């Protein structure tokens, strides 16, 4: 009869693409792409995500918390991600500031992108070092404390001096005060009122000049002294005064300069920030929601598959990455019993087949290992930069977008090439295995074997299920069927 | 006689490099590099390329079209690529503007980089909303229409008020007006003249102040009131007045502020732009020229080979990409009849050979498939970002150049590595094929063969042309030559 | 007796990782990672590195050399790398300039990053072309020459005209003057003094206005006229005047404008720079120290191994690149005499072994070739972009860091993948070799061979050391041992 080994044919259900064989029909395959479904925002499964600077604070917006307003002095917690849910934050709890006339509008979003936020316990510039020495910080008639007594902002001091008259100008210098690895943020401003008011509290009637130089540029301000826009973004009514503002940042080993004349509002406490973290644009949190990753287009999504297809957008957490077209991976053998590799005996005793389990387990193990190696591709991390904001200037934003687009395109192309290579490797390893089975088959058949050449052998005896289980198990001697075993090496 | 199979040797002509075997001489090779030849600029084979804003307009420059001058109101067509053929555009059809005193010089090049250009049907700021109620746009004695009647610009209104005196200042706010995915571009300015004139048309004799804040920064202007540079870039002679200009851009959900005093030239209609497209730096078009891709160094070039060697420069269309050094790909077999793989019989009847076509076609098919896969490398696309201009600031330009250089270097390295890998794979696949021929050879020779082991076999009979063509065709039985066929599987 | 061939087992000492086989114990391995040790700064083994602008000059700081001070006019040498050893360079040899009030502080660090530095032999704006014609450059009572005679700077001219009174304002234009591929740097300033003084030298008592426009932006200056900061950074004591400065840069085909009033200090000679080179941040040079590469974290380091593990920082020269985790490469065979591939004969004559050298040399050659190919990964170069400074603005610096980090992470991931692939390839090629030996073995045994199937063969005679050297050498005939040779191909 004829005994040989090979694979088992089956009905093909999927089609895969290689680099040399084109399209190959295979019985089974694994999908490595999916379409995410939208979901609400929530906390990451890894840690806390920040949406509001002071969740404990009530009646305070982000601008009030950033400005160190009285009755907005809560404790800021830590987080590993942030949501930018307001492109124009508002304030409601002190004297009116003309925010959309300088650059101090996007302050909370600047503080949003650091894990560690702490408030300075000192003062940016000593109060006893000014040119005109008898200076005090004037309490405001509007910004009352919790009890109701008048108070100042807390980070921006309304200054008054002993002298009342025209002044040529005074210059001051500011140095770094936070630690070595910390970012220092401060604010300073100017007071604007009617002509009669300034001549009563400052002694001048003409707009004054202020100059600020910092390791970000120069800024000249000569605020108008007269007609004002509408009164808004304040808790006090019938106010004839306005405040101009300007914020500055500093790193280790840096300094800046300020020149001013009558009507200057001095710096106070400052912010020390550290540990940059990513931020994403979306909506406010929803209670009791935990997701694997945050996507700026879909929301809270899981990661049931290493790659996904659909709209492209920023994401933070443990989520799939963009891929151009659907992909499939071979999970079986080429098409045309219990396992794939098996033996077969044909003759006048009908035809009888068996199965090998150890051999067929190795192929599945290799396929799983290759799948895991491909999966490992979506975890290139361990380098987080300071990043930039989202409403600064067109050129910077477009540069960031170009960088992200280049990265995404290159990663997608690499993924496609790797998929093709792995498909081809599996297809070839199948043939390797079927060949490797043949040498095993011929080792214990003796020298009376009459092999067909194409994997099949001829033997002069009949084989039954006992023969199949013997050759599969390994213990099979031709002698027990009556053919010569082999010559001993000992003459 | 002795019958075996193998490849047909040949004279080597080229040398190729692998990762393990060093330098290998092969009979034939395919070149994958070439040096392009320069050619004139022209239209892309895919679509239209834009060089002039209004090809139908006559007597108008790009500055006049961008400024919505009268008699320059043509239709702006669509295109997929642009050429920046003027780094300093000029104007000749209205009142003089001191362009190289602000930032409004590169206006046509700003409009050039969008596929869809459209002119607003409204007005940026309503004409009734100004603080002074009776306001009118004054026609100018210079900017005449086609007939000859006096006219205004059309995007910049000369404003005059009822009152004539010293004014503290007025502030206005500008909001987004184009659609969600459209970029809004507007311009505004101020009037400069001699001391005697302004006291008659505005009532002041001192330079005034203008302040503009936008999501690009702050801009303060106190134009001089006196000596003026020469009169140029205009169609009107003997004019004592000049105009200062400034342009601003806006996206969805954004706003800006303008504070001004006496002598302000208000905004009018604006531009809505969309669909960013790439631009390249070169010359004007030449009539009736169509090329495959546009290279900023060579011009219109074709793509006869996926890679090219030479100078590096920006390109738009379907063109090769930079490669460091020449490359070659194996297109044959190793060196030392009709096809390569074939049989041979040697004996007392001389030596007779045959050729196998089915196997020798498979190797060429695999080579072509690998070549196509490697060619597919140069089409990483499908993500175009807004990009930037060419005369903005040194740091931004150098950042763009750095990104492009890094991308090019990485692509060149990847291409070289892939070339080496494919060379080695092909050389090994040949050996695979010659081995696979041997099992085919031994299937139909029977059990009486006395194979040499090294691909050759010994049979005890002579072979003629019929023997060779029979074994190549496949139908060959030892029984017809008088040797035992095989043992039947049926006892 | 039984004769076969294979590898020699040995004691396993190292463990390596593949993509399918997991962890494999191997006899020998090669390490491709190391920890650098810090060392002093010095010159590169390739060329000269620049730390001081004029090493030959004595008594002059970098600011004085950049400002073309008298007695600081030495020759500037060439270099291939630069060290930024001062984040705040100082000056000590002329009239005081309020440096930290504009942007002219980091002038030496701007001249530092170009290989070719040359001082112009002309003048930026011809001195006989001003609005008021009788103009002169006033010598300073402070900035004396080496002899002691009064002198000017040499790059910045103190201007005085015939007229003395209020002036409306004057405008000048500056065009490119260096060659086509050269960067032009110029400086200009303004004079500040006390009120009574200017009325004696200029005829005014009020702060004046100066405006500069260049292809980098706008800059307006109205310096204060009165109380001054302390007197420092000069060689002259008891001086009541100060100078404000501003620097501008220009490329080919660019132009700029300056408007000024009374009290303007005019431009003089300028700088032409070319050939950008990289810079690193560190300390001053140490005499007689040469290293293979410069690392901004460790100092002068050598390159004993293509990859290194530890802290990440910028480097210049021929140095390794960052890698996440330690790596090892197979340098032997799988674990369980002179070489590894060898024969063995067993029988009643004990057991005897031999070694093959020609086969075992090929595996070493292949391993070394693959190692060289992997090493070649760390030489991606031949594209140097102009780069930027380190103290400009937060956004630009952060963008640079983002680009560098993206590059580093991608390179590390690629290196890891390639190491895994090469490990697998070597492990498989060993098995290839051991199989390939068997066909050679069976070629010269004759047709009476009784192969065991798994590489071993049975022969009917005894083999001695002579038999082993015969089979390894190749000359071995069964007839001289008493077996049939083969059937002759000629009937
Ligand atoms: C694989 O997933 C993609 C995307 O979800 C889908 O379009 C495709 O039909 C899926 N195919 C199979 C065989 O699962
Ligand atoms: C498909 O792959 C999975 C994952 O290894 C495996 O468990 C399963 O058996 C495969 N499919 C079939 C039909 O064997
Ligand atoms: C291949 O093309 C390059 C392109 O310049 C050329 O230098 C080289 O000589 C060519 N070689 C062959 C064999 O065609
Ligand atoms: C060279 O390659 C081309 C394209 O694959 C092929 O058509 C040609 O036959 C090859 N050369 C030879 C001599 O076969
Ligand atoms: C390989 O080098 C790394 C880098 O220092 C070291 O930690 C490791 O111990 C070394 N191992 C061997 C076997 O050389
Ligand atoms: C380790 O590799 C080197 C070169 O790669 C080789 O010279 C040496 O023989 C190898 N080690 C052993 C034990 O063979």
Author numbering:
A (entry chain C), B (entry chain A), C (entry chain B): 1 to 336, 360 to 514
Quote what the paper states about this structure:
In 2018, two novel influenza-like virus genomes were detected from the lungs of amphibian-Wuhan Asiatic toad (Bufo gargarizans) and the gill samples of ray finned fish-Wuhan spiny eel (Mastacembelus aculeatus), respectively. The HA of the Asiatic toad influenza-like virus (tHA) and spiny eel influenza-like virus (eHA) share 23.0% and 42.8% amino acid sequences homology with IBV HA, respectively. It was revealed that eHA could bind to monosialic ganglioside 2 (GM2) and mediates fusogenicity under various pH conditions. The tHA and eHA resembles the typical homotrimeric conformation.
To elucidate the molecular mechanism, the cryo-EM structures of the extracellular domain of apo-tHA and apo-eHA were determined at resolutions of 2.65 Å and 2.95 Å, respectively. While the amino acid sequence of eHA is only 42.8% identity to IBV HA, the overall structure of eHA is very similar to IBV HA, with an RMSD of 3 Å. In eHA, α-helix A and α-helix B are connected by an interhelical loop, similar to canonical HA. The overall packing of eHA is slightly looser than that of IAV and IBV, but more compact than that of tHA. For the eHA, the HA2 subunit of eHA exhibits significantly more intra-subunit interactions than HA1. Consequently, the structural integrity of the eHA trimer is likely maintained predominantly by the HA2 subunit. In eHA, the base of the groove is formed by N95, W158, W191 and Y202. Although there is a noticeable cavity at the RBS of eHA, this region exhibits a slight negative charge, which repels the negative charge of SA. Additionally, compared to IBV HA, the P238 in the 240-loop corresponds to T238 in eHA, and this change causes an outward shift in the 240-loop. Furthermore, we compared the RBS of all canonical IAV and IBV strains with that of eHA and found that only the 240-loop of eHA RBS is outward shift. These factors collectively contribute to eHA’s inability to bind to canonical SA receptors.
